[PDB]
Design a protein around this nucleic acid. Structure first.
Ligand code: BA
Ligand code: BA
Ligand code: BA
Length: 327
DNA sequence: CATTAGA
DNA sequence: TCTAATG
């Protein structure tokens, strides 16, 4: 967590590069398990040779560690940080809709900048287009104060369309977080569960609602069970318009909510942790259900949930308010 | 790890 | 169809 820091940090630094600037999925995969193990190790790596003893740790990386240990840096590292192509690859990527594949492609053509991008709006798809459009706002954080605002509206229209709707705003927000990145809306309906062969429209209904009133301002991608978008709080009595914000709406079988709800709310560790525990408690938790464990090794058969509670009761734990689901 | 776009 | 991009 800190005694093996630089290494893991230097390491990840290294792995990301392979993945991104290069297409070295394996090298990449390499640097990572390394950065992984050297991270778990209970002692200050004093030398490469030391480290090397490790699993994942080969002569290539060990070599890296002494060089880092020795001098407070790394050339490969200094070199890459300096390299313009590589710089450009890291940069275009932040564009929503821009992946590494695309990143290199653009660069190859010579589209290294923000402006490059505008000048060639044509070479961009709709997604990438919007991405480009709202580059600033997309990067910008979302004050909780806003999340309240957003969540308000969202709930109203959901209700307006059908009162049988169930929408919850999942994420760190859900968890009290003073600020969020985008808004996560897990949606459901009685009329939509495990078997009941869809009702795509169910999704379709609300999107349209959010639109009609001007909440949704763009579509990144809309499917029959998972919409991806852009929104904007109505800009007041002028002088202060609100930044475009990424939203995300997903349909859900009413018979899979709470798990997913439980799940999407995190935290990553809370999650994992509760999960660890259901295992002992003779269960299995996953984004969709909760099954009872069968000694033979495994078992199936999803227990019935009607609330975040049920899941709790099941693994006989203390109900934890989303607030304190931090870990 | 699953959904969407797209070409 | 595949393959990239989000989460
Ligand atoms: Ba080894
Ligand atoms: Ba991106
Ligand atoms: Ba998200």
């Amino acid at each position: 967590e800190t005694l093996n820091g630089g290494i893991t940090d230097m390491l990840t630094e290294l792995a990301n590069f392979e993945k991104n600037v290069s297409q070295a999925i394996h090298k990449y995969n390499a640097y990572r398990k390394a950065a992984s193990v050297i991270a778990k190790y209970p002692h200050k790596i004093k030398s490469g040779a030391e480290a090397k003893k490790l699993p994942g740790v080969g002569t290539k990386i060990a070599e890296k560690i002494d060089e880092f240990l020795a001098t407070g840096k790394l050339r490969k590292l200094e070199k890459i940080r300096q390299d313009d192509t590589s710089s450009s690859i890291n940069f275009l990527t932040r564009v929503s809709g821009i992946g590494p594949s695309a990143a290199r492609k653009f660069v190859d053509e010579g589209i290294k900048t923000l402006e490059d991008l505008r000048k060639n709006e044509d070479k961009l798809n709709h997604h990438q287009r919007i991405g480009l459009k709202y580059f600033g706002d997309f990067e910008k954080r979302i004050p909780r104060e806003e999340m309240l605002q957003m969540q308000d509206i969202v709930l109203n229209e959901v209700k307006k369309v059908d009162s049988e709707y169930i929408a919850t705003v999942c994420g760190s927000f859900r968890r009290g977080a003073e600020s969020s990145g985008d808004m996560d809306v897990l949606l459901t309906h009685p009329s939509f569960t495990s078997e009941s062969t869809k009702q795509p429209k169910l999704l379709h209904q609300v999107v349209e609602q959010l639109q009609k009133v001007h909440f949704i301002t763009d579509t990144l991608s809309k499917g029959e069970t998972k919409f991806m978008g852009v929104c904007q709080l109505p800009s007041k009595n002028d002088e202060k318009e609100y930044p475009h914000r990424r939203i995300d709406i997903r349909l859900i079988p009413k018979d899979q909510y709470y798990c997913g709800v439980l799940y999407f709310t995190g935290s990553d560790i809370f999650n994992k942790n509760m999960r660890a525990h259901a295992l002992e408690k003779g269960f299995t938790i996953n984004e969709y259900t909760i099954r009872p464990l069968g000694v033979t090794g495994v078992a199936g058969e999803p227990l019935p949930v009607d609330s975040e509670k049920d899941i709790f009761d099941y693994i006989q734990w203390k109900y934890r308010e989303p607030k304190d689901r931090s870990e």
